[PDB]
A paper describes a structure:
GSTs are a multifunctional superfamily of enzymes, distributed in all major kingdoms of living organisms. They are long established to catalyze the conjugation of the tripeptide glutathione with diverse electrophilic and hydrophobic compounds, resulting in their modification to display higher solubility and less toxicity. GSTs that belong to the phi class are dimeric enzymes, comprised of two identical subunits. Residues of the N-terminal domain residues assist the formation of a GSH binding site (G-site), whereas hydrophobic residues of the C-terminal domain form the hydrophobic substrate binding site (H-site).
The structures of sh101 and sh155 enzyme variants were resolved at 1.87 and 2.00 Å resolution and compared to the wild-type AmGSTF enzyme structure that has been recently reported. Sh101 and sh155 were crystallized with two and three molecules in the asymmetric unit, respectively. The sequence between the β2 and β3 strands where the α2 helix is located exhibits significant distortion due to high flexibility. In sh155, high flexibility was observed in the same region in two of the molecules, while in the third one sufficient density was found that enabled the building of the entire loop between β2 and β3. The variants sh101 and sh155 possess 11 and 17 mutations respectively, compared to the wild-type AmGSTF. Among the selected enzymes, sh101 and sh155 exhibited the highest improvement in kcat values (185.9 ± 1.8 min−1 and 197.7 ± 3.2 min−1, respectively), corresponding to an approximately 5-fold improvement, compared to the wild-type AmGSTF enzyme (35.9 ± 1.7 min−1). In particular, the Tm values of sh101 and sh155 enzyme variants were significantly increased by 8.3 and 5.2 °C compared to the parent enzyme AmGSTF. Inspection of the crystal structures of sh101 and sh155 shows that Lys93 can form a new salt bridge with Asp62 of the opposite subunit. However, it was estimated that sh49, sh155 and sh168 exhibited up to 3-fold lower IC50 values than the crop GSTFs. For example, the enzyme variant sh155 could potentially be a promising candidate for the development of a butachlor biosensor, since it combines low IC50 values with high catalytic activity.
Residue numbers in the entry:
A (entry chain C): 1 to 37, 54 to 216
B (entry chain A): 1 to 219
C (entry chain B): 2 to 38, 52 to 217
């Protein structure tokens, strides 16, 4: 009984990370669009949580099944692969890619101001070195942590999806194994539901 | 001849297919510039009458048509005479060659050439997107193979269906014209019987007339 | 002097050609041979003349054997011929691109090529096919056949690939579209269609 509730700009990457996870576990949830003064807020009965990645993990743990276990916290080695590539997103991939989408989308559209090209070109060069590594990893496996989708892959969706709305979306075609992995994600039923809540 | 009406943007390849056919049969017509696709919301009449959103729309008195190839053929049939018979439906053998090379355009040539037009022109102009060069290279390699067959065919005949211009050749003009406006025009130089055929088509008065109409707007 | 069709009889492009020959009551013989050992799949020989490409051949057949009882192209009636033409184009560029990859994924790849069914291609094609069938449902509630109140080349073109779609796990999708199923059963009750359907079951 009782769905959970996610309070936040229902197009933010922060909310998306959480909603994507809820969909993958089949949790009934409600999104209440609100902008505030940790971007997403989360209520489960009396319990109230903030912060994207912490709420995602709470969700994946709470609705974890033998069949849908996206953290693999019971298999040490699989959980280490989930964890390392979640860290790669947070400290290597996203810092190179998220400025591209903040400059090319949110700076003109939302927080109206011109697109800074020095930062975009620098982020593109760093992203290119990131994707080189991704290209090798995803030649060995279909997903980041191995041959099973996981939190690590899901963590990549929200910002990449907006990157795929910049004039640079085609950069991934220069890396056919990453492209295919991206395409593998975009076809998951749960991803396209969340993808439909986005696009400025 | 109560002038027939074509509805769509004249820059569009599907509009150009139809107006080239009208020009070649000498028919009176006018082109009403309007982009129904850009209109997300429609009347119940439109969606019942054109549920697939075929382009252009064509009006001949009380008759309403969509889909450029069907319209083009309607126009070639309606205004056909002994001196301009672009379908040859009288000659079973000639009609078969018109049909054959119309299909090659539809399923072999246009699929290889048209992505280059979108990547190199329609995208970095009317949508702002840069040119996906991975798409361009794959398409050029596909197109080179196609053009080897056309090269051979047009060394035996001046036109695709034989030794007479037909619907088959007219079908190739709209996308190829845009292709020839890109830096990739140079590719035809390696297929001298294809280039000579292209030049023969570009020299036709009806084609020069429709080519003039394929310029982007202004304001 | 019967005409000759060269290709595998189970092929969709052979079936397109032989359905037309059946409907026009022409005498012909099929010569099984896989000529790829453009490469248009059926080869067709009418004594002096030799054609390729199944749609050009089908129209040649319908043209040559044209009678008043059997006029499957309606070229003497500009308006009827335009409806034949539009719905032949919908097949070629809208209907067949949505439906044929299901036939290939569920049927051709496992059985002939020896490759399992890619469910991602199937699901994506199913989503496309559903939107197409919505429009066909609307069209076939207004008319018994795609071009109007008469069977035409346009209906004949849909037979080969749809026949194979009906052998996939997704055949039942057509029940969700009652006017289309009603149209499909009308085609399946035609005698010429019954004959060609029997030729499309290889060992
Ligand atoms: Na066609
Ligand atoms: Na097509």
């Amino acid at each position: 009984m009782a769905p959970v509730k996610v309070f936040g700009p229902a197009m933010s990457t922060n909310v998306a990370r959480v909603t994507l996870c809820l969909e993958e576990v089949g949790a009934e949830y409600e999104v209440v669009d609100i902008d505030f003064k940790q971007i997403p807020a989360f209520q489960d009965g009396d319990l109230l949580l903030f912060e994207s990645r912490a709420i995602a993990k709470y969700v994946l743990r709470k609705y974890k099944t033998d069949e849908v276990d996206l953290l693999r916290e019971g298999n040490l080695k699989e959980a280490a692969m989930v964890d390392v590539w979640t860290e790669v997103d947070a400290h290597t991939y996203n810092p190179a890619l998220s400025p591209i989408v903040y400059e090319c989308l949110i700076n003109p559209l939302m927080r109206g101001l011109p697109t800074n090209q020095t930062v975009v070109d620098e982020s593109l060069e760093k992203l290119k070195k990131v994707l080189e590594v991704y290209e090798a990893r995803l030649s060995q496996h279909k997903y980041l942590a191995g041959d099973f989708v996981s939190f690590a892959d899901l963590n990549h969706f929200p910002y990449t999806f907006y990157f795929m709305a910049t004039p640079h979306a085609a950069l991934f075609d220069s890396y056919p194994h990453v492209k295919a992995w991206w395409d593998r994600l975009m076809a998951r039923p749960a991803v396209k539901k969340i993808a439909a809540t986005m696009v400025p």
